[PDB]
Ligand binder design. Structure first.
Ligand SMILES: CC(C)(C)NS(=O)(=O)c1ccc2c(c1)C(=O)c1ccccc1C2=O
Length: 507
């Protein structure tokens, strides 16, 4: 029983080795660069551009906590002056941190529960660990949070619905903003009945502090490992956030492109074994899912080990069906064990990834949200199948870039879990989208040895028969018509892979 099947992993494409020498990094109408490109040097902390803080308090930019327009009725008082007074206090007990956060969040003093913060500090941490948190970590986090106007000098545009826009900022700038999110300083991001930011994920970390879930200390340890690292020694690299939407989608039934190569394995992970590859994040439409709340599956774990991903929540609007978010340069700060209810923070991780010409770690992650199916048979509906293909296609396609400069896609069981996705159908959908996007697939089954063989055998059968993307999509439509459309039973009589084998072998 082989641990992997198909094309050997060495024959696949990886970054930055398959990376077409980056053009000169520069701001444009579609690219926001928040640092001095001319002064960008390996191992040096980037210099913010502009030199002095410029504010934009409008419908198109992040509303900064340090904005002179961040005011509260007291007569208008400065909310930033208030944050400074509240946070520049000695913390010696968890109650001190809760009281400080709530001084500039009065309206939420009875709505925000801090049980997990109090229990982490008092009931989980040993005395010396609790001592290091309040004497060192927390004050260092306060100073970087309060440094926001000197660090994040340029207004950050919102990556709104249908925008094809990028933001390149420093990891230092991300650390100042994530320190602010921890202290819940972002204004207009808290109300349940909020309109302006209703289509945006939560950014402030208040939900990380609530309840008695045994996974809250693991999240907090994962997060404090990051905060300790970035306050102790300023990170030097950059990170790019790109919102992508495609105007024209393929006419799937008509696609003459052949299938690409497949490496399928029941061992390994996307982060370790998918180095230099386009790494899929099985995302929630509000990027990050329950990272700073309850969730702790594939997406939340990635956002906890690479905390720079979380900041996407500050500016990324809920993804529409034709959109994805591409994040390049996030660094891995933690190692972990388990998954979901068994997830535990292990130790600090020293990211060995090389950096590209823009000082970005050579780690490309794409957030693509699968559909949630109320009923199992819903996913076989042609509209639902086309949607999934178009989602993954937009996530894999790199407009302008040629086939030979495209790394393999590092993926697995996308949308299969609480979302009700069928692993075998989703594997074929990603295989077809990668084929149309002219990329090979590296598929991780995470201990599921039978699924590895099933995907492999089906990929090799269609490949050997020279079945195009169109031919395979036409078989999916026949499956729906024959087995799903007029089926009143919760499940079909025959499964998808046996239908395909029969349909082809009888043709
Ligand atoms: C989570 C991330 C993005 C940091 N890495 S990863 O490569 O995507 C991955 C590693 C391990 C597992 C899974 C995914 C997974 O989905 C899973 C599902 C059901 C049971 C166990 C696991 C599991 O251990």
């Amino acid at each position: 029983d082989k641990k992997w099947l198909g094309t050997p992993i060495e024959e696949m494409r990886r970054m930055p080795r398959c990376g077409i020498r980056l053009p000169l990094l520069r701001p444009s109408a579609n690219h926001t660069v928040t640092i001095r490109v001319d002064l960008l040097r390996a191992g040096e902390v980037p210099k913010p551009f502009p030199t002095h803080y410029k504010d934009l308090w409008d419908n198109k930019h992040v509303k900064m906590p340090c904005s002179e327009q961040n005011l509260y009725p007291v007569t208008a008082g400065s909310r930033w002056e208030l944050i400074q007074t509240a946070l520049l206090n000695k913390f010696t007990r968890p109650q001190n941190l809760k009281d400080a956060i709530l001084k500039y969040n009065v309206a939420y003093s009875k709505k925000w529960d801090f049980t997990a913060l109090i229990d982490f500090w008092d009931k989980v941490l040993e005395e010396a660990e609790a001592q290091h948190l309040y004497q060192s970590i927390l004050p260092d986090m306060v100073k970087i949070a309060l440094c926001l106007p000197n660090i994040c000098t340029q207004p950050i545009p919102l990556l709104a619905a249908a925008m094809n826009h990028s933001i390149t900022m420093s990891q230092e700038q991300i650390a100042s903003l994530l320190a602010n999110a921890f202290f819940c300083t972002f204004p207009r991001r808290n109300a349940k009945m909020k309109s302006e930011y209703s289509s945006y994920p939560d950014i402030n970390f208040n939900r990380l502090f609530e309840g008695r879930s045994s996974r809250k200390p693991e999240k907090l340890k994962t997060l404090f490992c990051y905060f300790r690292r970035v306050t102790a020694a300023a990170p030097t690299g950059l990170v790019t956030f790109t919102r992508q939407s495609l105007e024209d989608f393929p006419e799937w039934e008509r696609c003459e492109k052949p299938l690409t190569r497949l490496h399928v394995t029941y061992e390994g992970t996307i982060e370790e074994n998918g180095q230099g590859m386009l790494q899929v994040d099985f995302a929630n439409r509000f990027v990050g899912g329950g990272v700073t709340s309850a969730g702790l599956v594939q997406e939340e774990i990635r956002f906890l080990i690479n905390p720079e991903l979380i900041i996407s929540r500050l500016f990324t609007e809920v993804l529409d069906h034709n959109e994805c978010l591409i994040i390049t340069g996030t660094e891995q700060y933690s190692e972990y064990t388990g998954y979901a209810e068994t997830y535990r923070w292990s130790r600090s991780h020293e990211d060995g990834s090389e950096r590209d010409d823009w000082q970005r770690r050579c780690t490309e992650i794409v957030a693509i949200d699968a559909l949630h199916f109320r009923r199992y048979l819903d996913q076989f509906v042609p509209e639902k199948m086309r949607r999934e293909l178009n989602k993954a296609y937009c996530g894999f396609l790199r407009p302008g870039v040629s086939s030979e400069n495209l790394s393999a896609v590092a993926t697995g069981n996308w949308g299969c879990g609480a979302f009700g996705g069928d692993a075998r159908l989703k594997a074929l959908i990603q295989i077809l989208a990668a084929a149309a996007a002219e990329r090979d697939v590296v598929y991780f089954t995470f201990g599921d040895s039978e699924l590895m063989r099933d995907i492999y055998s089906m990929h090799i059968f269609l490949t050997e028969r020279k079945l195009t993307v169109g031919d395979v999509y036409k078989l999916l439509l026949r499956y729906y018509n024959e087995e799903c459309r007029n089926c009143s039973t919760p499940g079909p009589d025959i499964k998808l892979y046996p239908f395909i084998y029969h349909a082809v072998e009888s043709c």
